[PDB]
Amino acid sequence: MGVNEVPDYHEDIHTYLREMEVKCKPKVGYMKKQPDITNSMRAILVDWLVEVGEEYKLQNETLHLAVNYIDRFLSSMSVLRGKLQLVGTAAMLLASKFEEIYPPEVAEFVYITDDTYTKKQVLRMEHLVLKVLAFDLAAPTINQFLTQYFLHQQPANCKVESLAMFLGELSLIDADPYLKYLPSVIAAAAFHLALYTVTGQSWPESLVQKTGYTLETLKPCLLDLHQTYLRAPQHAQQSIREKYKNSKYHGVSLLNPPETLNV
Template sequence: AEMSQYGLRDENQENVQPRKAPLQQAGPQGGRTVLGVLQENRGLRGAQGRGGKQHPVPGMEGLDHESLQSNNSPMDMSIVDEEEKVVSSNAVQDYAEEIHTYLREMEIKCKPKAGYMQKQPDITNNMRAILVDWLVEVGEEYKLQNETLYLAVNYIDRFLSSMSVLRGKLQLVGTAAMLLASKFEEIYPPEVAEFVYITDDTYNKKQVLKMEHLVLKVLSFDLAAPTILQYLNQYFRLHPVASKMESLCM
Protein backbone atom coordinates (compact mmCIF):
# COMPACT_ATOMS: atom_id res chain seq x y z
CA ALA A 1 0.00 0.00 0.00
CA GLU A 2 1.36 3.43 -0.95
CA MET A 3 0.95 6.80 0.68
CA SER A 4 -1.66 8.97 -1.00
CA GLN A 5 -1.03 12.43 -2.42
CA TYR A 6 -2.06 13.87 0.95
CA GLY A 7 0.69 12.04 2.80
CA LEU A 8 -1.93 9.77 4.37
CA ARG A 9 -2.68 6.10 4.58
CA ASP A 10 -5.53 4.08 6.01
CA GLU A 11 -4.79 2.55 9.42
CA ASN A 12 -6.41 -0.68 8.24
CA GLN A 13 -3.69 -1.23 5.66
CA GLU A 14 -0.38 -2.98 6.30
CA ASN A 15 2.32 -0.96 8.04
CA VAL A 16 4.06 1.44 5.69
CA GLN A 17 7.19 3.38 6.54
CA PRO A 18 6.36 6.92 5.37
CA ARG A 19 8.98 9.38 4.31
CA LYS A 20 9.94 11.95 6.90
CA ALA A 21 8.86 15.53 6.43
CA PRO A 22 10.14 18.51 8.42
CA LEU A 23 7.82 20.05 10.98
CA GLN A 24 8.50 23.43 9.45
CA GLN A 25 8.30 23.95 5.74
CA ALA A 26 9.23 26.90 3.59
CA GLY A 27 6.15 28.31 1.90
CA PRO A 28 6.00 29.72 -1.58
CA GLN A 29 7.57 32.96 -0.33
CA GLY A 30 10.33 31.18 1.59
CA GLY A 31 11.19 31.21 5.27
CA ARG A 32 7.63 30.73 6.49
CA THR A 33 6.61 28.11 8.98
CA VAL A 34 3.85 25.59 8.50
CA LEU A 35 1.88 27.19 11.33
CA GLY A 36 1.55 30.70 9.95
CA VAL A 37 2.02 33.81 12.08
CA LEU A 38 -1.46 35.29 12.52
CA GLN A 39 -0.08 38.58 13.76
CA GLU A 40 0.88 39.37 10.16
CA ASN A 41 -2.68 38.81 9.00
CA ARG A 42 -4.59 41.08 11.41
CA GLY A 43 -5.90 43.22 8.56
CA LEU A 44 -7.28 40.24 6.65
CA ARG A 45 -10.90 40.67 7.71
CA GLY A 46 -10.79 44.46 7.75
CA ALA A 47 -11.36 46.88 4.92
CA GLN A 48 -7.77 46.54 3.69
CA GLY A 49 -6.95 43.77 1.23
CA ARG A 50 -3.59 42.15 0.61
CA GLY A 51 -2.51 44.93 -1.66
CA GLY A 52 -3.59 47.65 0.76
CA LYS A 53 -6.51 48.72 -1.44
CA GLN A 54 -10.01 49.36 -0.23
CA HIS A 55 -12.61 46.72 -1.09
CA PRO A 56 -16.02 48.38 -0.59
CA VAL A 57 -19.12 46.27 -0.36
CA PRO A 58 -21.18 46.60 -3.57
CA GLY A 59 -24.15 48.92 -3.09
CA MET A 60 -22.77 50.45 0.13
CA GLU A 61 -20.64 53.22 -1.38
CA GLY A 62 -23.05 55.97 -0.39
CA LEU A 63 -23.33 55.05 3.27
CA ASP A 64 -21.12 56.64 5.90
CA HIS A 65 -20.09 55.21 9.25
CA GLU A 66 -22.81 57.02 11.19
CA SER A 67 -25.59 55.70 8.97
CA LEU A 68 -24.34 52.15 9.47
CA GLN A 69 -24.38 52.63 13.24
CA SER A 70 -27.87 54.12 13.32
CA ASN A 71 -30.41 52.37 15.51
CA ASN A 72 -32.81 52.44 12.59
CA SER A 73 -30.47 50.47 10.38
CA PRO A 74 -31.85 47.03 9.46
CA MET A 75 -28.28 45.71 9.76
CA ASP A 76 -28.01 46.55 13.47
CA MET A 77 -28.07 43.04 14.91
CA SER A 78 -28.09 44.34 18.49
CA ILE A 79 -31.77 45.22 18.12
CA VAL A 80 -33.47 41.87 18.47
CA ASP A 81 -36.74 41.32 20.25
CA GLU A 82 -36.56 38.87 23.12
CA GLU A 83 -38.98 36.47 21.44
CA GLU A 84 -36.80 36.45 18.30
CA LYS A 85 -33.59 35.41 20.04
CA VAL A 86 -32.41 31.88 19.29
CA VAL A 87 -33.02 29.46 22.14
CA SER A 88 -30.39 26.81 22.77
CA SER A 89 -31.67 23.26 22.48
CA ASN A 90 -30.01 22.56 25.82
CA ALA A 91 -32.26 25.19 27.42
CA VAL A 92 -35.51 23.42 26.48
CA GLN A 93 -36.36 21.95 29.86
CA ASP A 94 -39.14 19.65 28.66
CA TYR A 95 -36.71 17.75 26.45
CA ALA A 96 -33.60 17.98 28.62
CA GLU A 97 -33.52 14.28 29.48
CA GLU A 98 -34.03 13.18 25.88
CA ILE A 99 -31.36 15.61 24.69
CA HIS A 100 -28.88 14.31 27.25
CA THR A 101 -29.58 10.71 26.26
CA TYR A 102 -29.07 11.55 22.59
CA LEU A 103 -25.80 13.33 23.33
CA ARG A 104 -24.47 10.31 25.21
CA GLU A 105 -25.39 8.01 22.33
CA MET A 106 -23.71 10.28 19.78
CA GLU A 107 -20.69 10.65 22.04
CA ILE A 108 -20.01 6.93 21.73
CA LYS A 109 -20.47 7.05 17.97
CA CYS A 110 -18.30 10.12 17.40
CA LYS A 111 -15.42 9.59 19.81
CA PRO A 112 -11.82 9.06 18.62
CA LYS A 113 -9.97 5.84 19.34
CA ALA A 114 -8.07 5.68 22.62
CA GLY A 115 -4.32 5.96 22.17
CA TYR A 116 -4.58 6.62 18.45
CA MET A 117 -1.48 8.82 18.50
CA GLN A 118 0.70 5.82 19.34
CA LYS A 119 -0.09 4.42 15.89
CA GLN A 120 0.92 7.62 14.12
CA PRO A 121 4.41 7.06 12.66
CA ASP A 122 5.32 10.68 11.90
CA ILE A 123 3.45 13.00 14.29
CA THR A 124 3.41 13.36 18.06
CA ASN A 125 1.14 14.66 20.82
CA ASN A 126 3.25 17.81 20.94
CA MET A 127 2.61 18.48 17.25
CA ARG A 128 -1.11 18.03 17.85
CA ALA A 129 -0.92 20.52 20.74
CA ILE A 130 0.81 23.07 18.49
CA LEU A 131 -1.92 22.58 15.88
CA VAL A 132 -4.71 23.09 18.43
CA ASP A 133 -3.01 26.24 19.77
CA TRP A 134 -2.91 27.57 16.23
CA LEU A 135 -6.60 26.78 15.74
CA VAL A 136 -7.37 28.71 18.94
CA GLU A 137 -5.66 31.74 17.38
CA VAL A 138 -7.61 31.23 14.16
CA GLY A 139 -10.85 31.18 16.15
CA GLU A 140 -9.90 34.40 17.93
CA GLU A 141 -8.84 36.05 14.68
CA TYR A 142 -12.20 35.36 13.01
CA LYS A 143 -14.28 35.62 16.19
CA LEU A 144 -15.63 32.11 15.76
CA GLN A 145 -17.87 30.35 18.27
CA ASN A 146 -16.22 28.19 20.92
CA GLU A 147 -18.25 25.26 19.64
CA THR A 148 -16.55 25.62 16.25
CA LEU A 149 -13.14 25.03 17.83
CA TYR A 150 -14.37 22.04 19.84
CA LEU A 151 -15.90 20.47 16.75
CA ALA A 152 -12.74 21.02 14.72
CA VAL A 153 -10.63 19.26 17.36
CA ASN A 154 -13.12 16.39 17.40
CA TYR A 155 -12.88 16.05 13.62
CA ILE A 156 -9.08 16.05 13.77
CA ASP A 157 -8.90 13.38 16.46
CA ARG A 158 -11.39 11.13 14.68
CA PHE A 159 -9.57 11.57 11.38
CA LEU A 160 -6.20 10.74 12.95
CA SER A 161 -7.79 7.68 14.53
CA SER A 162 -8.32 6.24 11.05
CA MET A 163 -5.57 7.75 8.90
CA SER A 164 -1.80 8.10 9.28
CA VAL A 165 -0.66 11.63 8.48
CA LEU A 166 2.76 13.03 7.69
CA ARG A 167 3.74 16.03 9.77
CA GLY A 168 3.90 18.22 6.68
CA LYS A 169 0.18 17.60 6.09
CA LEU A 170 -1.00 17.92 9.69
CA GLN A 171 -1.85 21.60 9.36
CA LEU A 172 -3.79 20.85 6.17
CA VAL A 173 -5.93 18.38 8.13
CA GLY A 174 -6.49 20.99 10.85
CA THR A 175 -7.38 23.67 8.31
CA ALA A 176 -9.92 21.42 6.59
CA ALA A 177 -11.41 20.43 9.96
CA MET A 178 -11.78 24.08 10.99
CA LEU A 179 -13.37 24.88 7.63
CA LEU A 180 -15.91 22.08 8.10
CA ALA A 181 -16.66 23.09 11.68
CA SER A 182 -17.16 26.71 10.58
CA LYS A 183 -19.61 25.68 7.89
CA PHE A 184 -21.48 23.52 10.38
CA GLU A 185 -21.63 26.00 13.27
CA GLU A 186 -21.16 29.57 12.02
CA ILE A 187 -23.76 31.77 10.38
CA TYR A 188 -21.10 33.44 8.25
CA PRO A 189 -18.10 31.08 8.03
CA PRO A 190 -14.80 32.39 6.65
CA GLU A 191 -14.18 31.78 2.97
CA VAL A 192 -11.82 29.04 1.80
CA ALA A 193 -9.41 31.69 0.52
CA GLU A 194 -9.08 33.08 4.03
CA PHE A 195 -8.15 29.68 5.43
CA VAL A 196 -5.53 29.41 2.68
CA TYR A 197 -4.17 32.83 3.59
CA ILE A 198 -3.78 32.15 7.31
CA THR A 199 -1.59 29.15 6.48
CA ASP A 200 0.79 31.61 4.77
CA ASP A 201 -0.24 30.01 1.47
CA THR A 202 1.46 26.77 2.48
CA TYR A 203 -1.49 25.03 0.81
CA ASN A 204 -3.66 26.19 -2.05
CA LYS A 205 -7.43 26.28 -2.31
CA LYS A 206 -7.60 23.04 -4.27
CA GLN A 207 -5.63 21.17 -1.60
CA VAL A 208 -7.84 22.47 1.20
CA LEU A 209 -11.03 21.48 -0.62
CA LYS A 210 -9.69 18.02 -1.44
CA MET A 211 -8.71 17.48 2.18
CA GLU A 212 -12.15 18.70 3.27
CA HIS A 213 -13.70 16.05 1.02
CA LEU A 214 -11.41 13.36 2.45
CA VAL A 215 -12.21 14.33 6.05
CA LEU A 216 -15.92 14.14 5.29
CA LYS A 217 -15.46 10.71 3.77
CA VAL A 218 -13.42 9.36 6.70
CA LEU A 219 -15.94 10.77 9.21
CA SER A 220 -18.83 9.33 7.18
CA PHE A 221 -20.36 12.83 7.18
CA ASP A 222 -21.12 12.54 10.93
CA LEU A 223 -20.43 16.16 11.87
CA ALA A 224 -22.93 16.66 14.71
CA ALA A 225 -20.54 15.40 17.36
CA PRO A 226 -21.26 16.22 21.02
CA THR A 227 -18.65 18.43 22.69
CA ILE A 228 -17.88 19.43 26.26
CA LEU A 229 -19.57 22.77 25.63
CA GLN A 230 -22.99 21.13 25.27
CA TYR A 231 -22.58 19.25 28.54
CA LEU A 232 -21.42 22.42 30.28
CA ASN A 233 -24.51 24.26 29.07
CA GLN A 234 -26.70 21.53 30.52
CA TYR A 235 -24.82 21.60 33.81
CA PHE A 236 -25.00 25.40 34.16
CA ARG A 237 -28.73 25.33 33.44
CA LEU A 238 -29.26 22.97 36.39
CA HIS A 239 -26.54 24.42 38.61
CA PRO A 240 -26.11 28.15 37.92
CA VAL A 241 -22.70 29.62 38.71
CA ALA A 242 -21.17 33.08 38.58
CA SER A 243 -20.72 34.44 35.07
CA LYS A 244 -16.95 34.67 35.55
CA MET A 245 -16.76 31.00 36.48
CA GLU A 246 -18.94 30.07 33.52
CA SER A 247 -16.71 32.03 31.15
CA LEU A 248 -13.59 30.33 32.50
CA CYS A 249 -15.15 26.90 31.97
CA MET A 250 -16.35 27.62 28.46
Protein backbone atom coordinates (compact mmCIF):
# COMPACT_ATOMS: atom_id res chain seq x y z
CA MET A 1 0.00 0.00 0.00
CA GLY A 2 1.21 3.49 -0.87
CA VAL A 3 4.55 4.01 -2.61
CA ASN A 4 5.14 0.26 -2.32
CA GLU A 5 2.29 -0.38 -4.78
CA VAL A 6 3.48 2.54 -6.97
CA PRO A 7 0.14 4.38 -7.33
CA ASP A 8 1.53 6.97 -9.77
CA TYR A 9 3.08 4.54 -12.28
CA HIS A 10 1.16 1.27 -11.85
CA GLU A 11 -0.96 1.88 -14.95
CA ASP A 12 2.06 3.07 -16.94
CA ILE A 13 4.08 0.05 -15.80
CA HIS A 14 1.23 -2.30 -16.71
CA THR A 15 0.86 -0.78 -20.19
CA TYR A 16 4.63 -0.98 -20.70
CA LEU A 17 4.65 -4.63 -19.62
CA ARG A 18 1.76 -5.39 -21.97
CA GLU A 19 3.69 -3.83 -24.85
CA MET A 20 6.91 -5.61 -23.83
CA GLU A 21 5.49 -9.13 -23.47
CA VAL A 22 4.88 -9.25 -27.24
CA LYS A 23 8.54 -8.55 -28.00
CA CYS A 24 9.89 -11.10 -25.50
CA LYS A 25 7.42 -13.78 -26.65
CA PRO A 26 9.10 -16.97 -27.93
CA LYS A 27 8.15 -18.33 -31.32
CA VAL A 28 5.15 -20.64 -31.11
CA GLY A 29 6.03 -24.22 -32.01
CA TYR A 30 9.80 -23.81 -32.21
CA MET A 31 10.29 -27.42 -31.10
CA LYS A 32 9.43 -28.59 -34.63
CA LYS A 33 12.46 -26.66 -35.90
CA GLN A 34 14.62 -28.41 -33.30
CA PRO A 35 15.77 -31.74 -34.82
CA ASP A 36 17.09 -33.32 -31.59
CA ILE A 37 14.82 -32.29 -28.68
CA THR A 38 11.07 -32.48 -28.13
CA ASN A 39 8.58 -31.18 -25.56
CA SER A 40 9.25 -34.09 -23.18
CA MET A 41 12.88 -33.04 -22.71
CA ARG A 42 11.77 -29.44 -22.21
CA ALA A 43 9.24 -30.50 -19.57
CA ILE A 44 11.88 -32.57 -17.76
CA LEU A 45 14.31 -29.65 -17.87
CA VAL A 46 11.72 -27.22 -16.49
CA ASP A 47 10.86 -29.67 -13.70
CA TRP A 48 14.55 -29.97 -12.85
CA LEU A 49 14.79 -26.17 -12.85
CA VAL A 50 11.87 -26.00 -10.42
CA GLU A 51 13.66 -28.47 -8.14
CA VAL A 52 16.91 -26.49 -8.42
CA GLY A 53 15.15 -23.25 -7.51
CA GLU A 54 13.51 -25.00 -4.56
CA GLU A 55 16.96 -26.20 -3.46
CA TYR A 56 18.54 -22.72 -3.35
CA LYS A 57 15.38 -20.89 -2.17
CA LEU A 58 15.29 -18.74 -5.30
CA GLN A 59 12.39 -16.47 -6.23
CA ASN A 60 9.59 -17.64 -8.50
CA GLU A 61 10.42 -14.73 -10.80
CA THR A 62 13.87 -16.27 -11.28
CA LEU A 63 12.33 -19.53 -12.49
CA HIS A 64 9.87 -17.76 -14.79
CA LEU A 65 12.67 -15.63 -16.26
CA ALA A 66 14.90 -18.68 -16.74
CA VAL A 67 12.15 -20.55 -18.59
CA ASN A 68 11.55 -17.48 -20.76
CA TYR A 69 15.27 -17.29 -21.57
CA ILE A 70 15.39 -21.00 -22.42
CA ASP A 71 12.38 -20.73 -24.73
CA ARG A 72 13.76 -17.63 -26.47
CA PHE A 73 17.20 -19.21 -26.89
CA LEU A 74 15.78 -22.44 -28.31
CA SER A 75 13.45 -20.54 -30.65
CA SER A 76 16.48 -19.14 -32.52
CA MET A 77 19.24 -21.70 -31.83
CA SER A 78 19.48 -25.46 -32.38
CA VAL A 79 21.02 -27.51 -29.57
CA LEU A 80 21.69 -31.19 -29.03
CA ARG A 81 20.18 -33.31 -26.26
CA GLY A 82 23.31 -33.55 -24.12
CA LYS A 83 23.77 -29.78 -24.16
CA LEU A 84 20.15 -28.95 -23.24
CA GLN A 85 20.68 -29.08 -19.48
CA LEU A 86 23.70 -26.82 -19.93
CA VAL A 87 21.65 -24.05 -21.52
CA GLY A 88 19.08 -24.45 -18.76
CA THR A 89 21.79 -24.02 -16.15
CA ALA A 90 23.10 -20.97 -17.99
CA ALA A 91 19.64 -19.43 -18.16
CA MET A 92 19.08 -20.08 -14.47
CA LEU A 93 22.42 -18.46 -13.68
CA LEU A 94 21.53 -15.43 -15.78
CA ALA A 95 18.09 -15.20 -14.20
CA SER A 96 19.67 -15.19 -10.75
CA LYS A 97 22.12 -12.48 -11.80
CA PHE A 98 19.10 -10.43 -12.87
CA GLU A 99 16.79 -11.10 -9.92
CA GLU A 100 18.44 -12.41 -6.76
CA ILE A 101 20.02 -10.13 -4.17
CA TYR A 102 22.45 -12.99 -3.42
CA PRO A 103 22.55 -15.20 -6.52
CA PRO A 104 24.29 -18.56 -6.16
CA GLU A 105 27.86 -18.78 -7.36
CA VAL A 106 28.84 -20.52 -10.59
CA ALA A 107 30.34 -23.31 -8.48
CA GLU A 108 26.89 -24.12 -7.10
CA PHE A 109 25.42 -24.19 -10.61
CA VAL A 110 28.13 -26.65 -11.65
CA TYR A 111 27.41 -28.66 -8.48
CA ILE A 112 23.68 -29.09 -9.13
CA THR A 113 24.60 -29.90 -12.73
CA ASP A 114 26.18 -33.10 -11.27
CA ASP A 115 29.54 -32.46 -12.98
CA THR A 116 28.41 -33.28 -16.52
CA TYR A 117 29.53 -29.78 -17.57
CA THR A 118 32.55 -27.79 -16.29
CA LYS A 119 32.75 -24.19 -15.07
CA LYS A 120 34.34 -23.04 -18.33
CA GLN A 121 31.53 -24.73 -20.27
CA VAL A 122 28.90 -23.02 -18.11
CA LEU A 123 30.52 -19.61 -18.61
CA ARG A 124 30.79 -20.19 -22.37
CA MET A 125 27.11 -21.14 -22.52
CA GLU A 126 26.20 -18.06 -20.48
CA HIS A 127 28.09 -15.91 -22.98
CA LEU A 128 26.31 -17.65 -25.87
CA VAL A 129 22.88 -17.15 -24.28
CA LEU A 130 23.64 -13.47 -23.63
CA LYS A 131 24.73 -13.04 -27.25
CA VAL A 132 21.65 -14.79 -28.66
CA LEU A 133 19.19 -12.93 -26.43
CA ALA A 134 21.05 -9.67 -27.24
CA PHE A 135 21.08 -8.79 -23.52
CA ASP A 136 17.27 -8.62 -23.46
CA LEU A 137 17.01 -10.14 -20.00
CA ALA A 138 14.18 -7.91 -18.70
CA ALA A 139 11.10 -9.83 -19.79
CA PRO A 140 7.53 -9.79 -18.44
CA THR A 141 6.46 -13.05 -16.82
CA ILE A 142 3.31 -14.64 -15.42
CA ASN A 143 4.53 -13.69 -11.94
CA GLN A 144 4.81 -10.00 -12.88
CA PHE A 145 1.18 -9.85 -14.03
CA LEU A 146 -0.23 -12.06 -11.27
CA THR A 147 1.42 -9.83 -8.67
CA GLN A 148 -0.33 -6.76 -10.12
CA TYR A 149 -3.63 -8.65 -10.43
CA PHE A 150 -3.50 -9.62 -6.75
CA LEU A 151 -4.04 -5.97 -5.78
CA HIS A 152 -7.61 -6.05 -7.16
CA GLN A 153 -9.01 -8.71 -4.80
CA GLN A 154 -11.07 -7.50 -1.84
CA PRO A 155 -10.64 -8.91 0.75
CA ALA A 156 -7.15 -10.31 0.15
CA ASN A 157 -6.71 -14.08 0.38
CA CYS A 158 -3.24 -15.63 0.44
CA LYS A 159 -4.71 -19.01 -0.54
CA VAL A 160 -5.95 -17.45 -3.79
CA GLU A 161 -2.53 -15.92 -4.46
CA SER A 162 -0.71 -19.19 -3.75
CA LEU A 163 -3.11 -21.16 -5.97
CA ALA A 164 -2.68 -18.61 -8.77
CA MET A 165 1.10 -18.93 -8.47
CA PHE A 166 0.80 -22.72 -8.48
CA LEU A 167 -1.30 -22.68 -11.66
CA GLY A 168 1.05 -20.20 -13.34
CA GLU A 169 4.00 -22.46 -12.54
CA LEU A 170 2.08 -25.51 -13.79
CA SER A 171 1.64 -23.68 -17.09
CA LEU A 172 5.45 -23.44 -17.37
CA ILE A 173 6.02 -27.20 -17.68
CA ASP A 174 3.96 -27.79 -20.83
CA ALA A 175 4.96 -25.86 -23.93
CA ASP A 176 1.77 -27.15 -25.56
CA PRO A 177 -0.50 -25.20 -25.44
CA TYR A 178 0.86 -22.34 -23.28
CA LEU A 179 3.35 -21.17 -25.91
CA LYS A 180 0.46 -19.52 -27.79
CA TYR A 181 -0.72 -17.46 -24.80
CA LEU A 182 0.84 -14.27 -23.52
CA PRO A 183 1.93 -14.14 -19.86
CA SER A 184 -0.90 -11.69 -19.10
CA VAL A 185 -3.56 -14.06 -20.46
CA ILE A 186 -2.17 -17.03 -18.51
CA ALA A 187 -1.91 -14.88 -15.38
CA ALA A 188 -5.52 -13.74 -15.77
CA ALA A 189 -6.77 -17.29 -16.32
CA ALA A 190 -4.78 -18.55 -13.33
CA PHE A 191 -6.10 -15.75 -11.11
CA HIS A 192 -9.71 -16.41 -12.13
CA LEU A 193 -9.31 -20.17 -11.64
CA ALA A 194 -7.77 -19.65 -8.20
CA LEU A 195 -10.56 -17.26 -7.21
CA TYR A 196 -13.22 -19.72 -8.36
CA THR A 197 -11.54 -22.68 -6.65
CA VAL A 198 -10.96 -20.99 -3.28
CA THR A 199 -13.68 -18.39 -2.71
CA GLY A 200 -16.06 -19.18 -5.58
CA GLN A 201 -15.73 -15.67 -7.05
CA SER A 202 -14.93 -14.84 -10.69
CA TRP A 203 -12.79 -12.48 -12.76
CA PRO A 204 -13.15 -9.06 -11.09
CA GLU A 205 -14.95 -6.20 -12.80
CA SER A 206 -12.14 -3.84 -11.75
CA LEU A 207 -9.68 -6.00 -13.72
CA VAL A 208 -11.69 -6.29 -16.94
CA GLN A 209 -11.43 -2.49 -17.13
CA LYS A 210 -7.69 -2.47 -16.38
CA THR A 211 -6.68 -5.30 -18.73
CA GLY A 212 -9.57 -5.51 -21.19
CA TYR A 213 -9.82 -9.27 -20.59
CA THR A 214 -13.41 -10.48 -20.33
CA LEU A 215 -14.36 -14.00 -19.32
CA GLU A 216 -15.18 -14.71 -22.98
CA THR A 217 -11.68 -13.98 -24.33
CA LEU A 218 -10.00 -15.84 -21.44
CA LYS A 219 -11.92 -19.04 -22.25
CA PRO A 220 -9.34 -20.67 -24.61
CA CYS A 221 -6.63 -20.40 -21.94
CA LEU A 222 -9.04 -21.11 -19.07
CA LEU A 223 -10.10 -24.44 -20.56
CA ASP A 224 -6.50 -25.63 -20.91
CA LEU A 225 -5.59 -24.40 -17.42
CA HIS A 226 -8.59 -26.24 -15.96
CA GLN A 227 -7.70 -29.39 -17.91
CA THR A 228 -4.13 -29.50 -16.63
CA TYR A 229 -5.26 -28.57 -13.12
CA LEU A 230 -7.51 -31.64 -13.20
CA ARG A 231 -4.68 -33.77 -14.63
CA ALA A 232 -1.96 -32.46 -12.29
CA PRO A 233 -1.90 -35.56 -10.01
CA GLN A 234 -1.31 -37.84 -13.01
CA HIS A 235 1.40 -35.68 -14.60
CA ALA A 236 4.83 -37.24 -15.06
CA GLN A 237 6.51 -34.10 -13.70
CA GLN A 238 5.42 -33.71 -10.07
CA SER A 239 8.04 -31.32 -8.67
CA ILE A 240 5.68 -28.33 -8.63
CA ARG A 241 3.01 -30.28 -6.72
CA GLU A 242 5.60 -31.25 -4.11
CA LYS A 243 6.90 -27.67 -3.93
CA TYR A 244 3.42 -26.22 -3.41
CA LYS A 245 2.49 -28.79 -0.76
CA ASN A 246 4.52 -26.84 1.82
CA SER A 247 2.87 -24.76 4.53
CA LYS A 248 4.48 -21.56 3.21
CA TYR A 249 2.30 -21.99 0.10
CA HIS A 250 -0.72 -22.99 2.24
CA GLY A 251 -0.76 -26.47 0.68
CA VAL A 252 -2.58 -25.28 -2.42
CA SER A 253 -1.56 -28.33 -4.46
CA LEU A 254 -3.55 -30.45 -1.98
CA LEU A 255 -6.82 -28.71 -2.86
CA ASN A 256 -9.43 -30.29 -5.11
CA PRO A 257 -9.99 -28.68 -8.52
CA PRO A 258 -13.59 -27.71 -9.29
CA GLU A 259 -15.55 -30.43 -11.06
CA THR A 260 -16.75 -28.03 -13.77
CA LEU A 261 -16.17 -24.40 -14.70
CA ASN A 262 -19.05 -21.92 -14.36
CA VAL A 263 -18.03 -20.12 -17.54
